[PDB]
């Protein structure tokens, strides 16, 4: 054709982590929550099929799948770790998904809680008409 398209989508990955007043019965010291969302309350479900959070193997059932927003996991724990996150698209071509290795870090007692935000730009060059329609509703 005479024309081509490049679509850019912004994602926000982030987490909050707080030292518990009182450890859990297992002795877990922190409460945390990790999330994937669009910026400024934008709807990313238009183009996201699901978000898979791969927790550390010490967690029971570490593969946590979110098929609907909010795309998040809340847990209690004792150590920070790398958390691979897979964002799956409502796309029939490539790419079908994208992966981010998210640093789920915790702060020691006596320091402010963690409130971290990580911004990611995705670029889709010449998506299918169908995927383009989904991306550009978001």
């Amino acid at each position: 054709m005479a024309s081509s398209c490049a679509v850019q989508v912004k994602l926000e990955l982030g987490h909050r982590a707080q030292v518990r007043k009182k450890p859990t019965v297992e002795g877990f010291t922190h409460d945390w929550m990790v999330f994937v969302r669009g910026p400024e309350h934008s709807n990313i479900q238009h183009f996201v099929e699901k978000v898979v959070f791969h927790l550390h193997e010490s967690f029971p059932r570490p593969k946590r799948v979110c098929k609907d927003p909010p795309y998040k996991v809340e847990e209690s724990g004792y150590a920070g770790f790398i958390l691979p996150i897979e964002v799956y698209f409502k796309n029939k071509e490539e790419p079908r998904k994208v992966r981010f290795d998210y640093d789920l870090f915790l702060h020691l007692e006596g320091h402010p809680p963690v409130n971290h935000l990580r911004c990611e730009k995705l670029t889709f060059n010449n998506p299918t008409e169908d995927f383009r329609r989904k991306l550009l509703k978001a």
Partner: peptide, 5 residues
């Protein structure tokens, strides 16, 4: 930061 695993 706390310890890691």
């Amino acid at each position: 930061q706390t310890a890691r695993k």
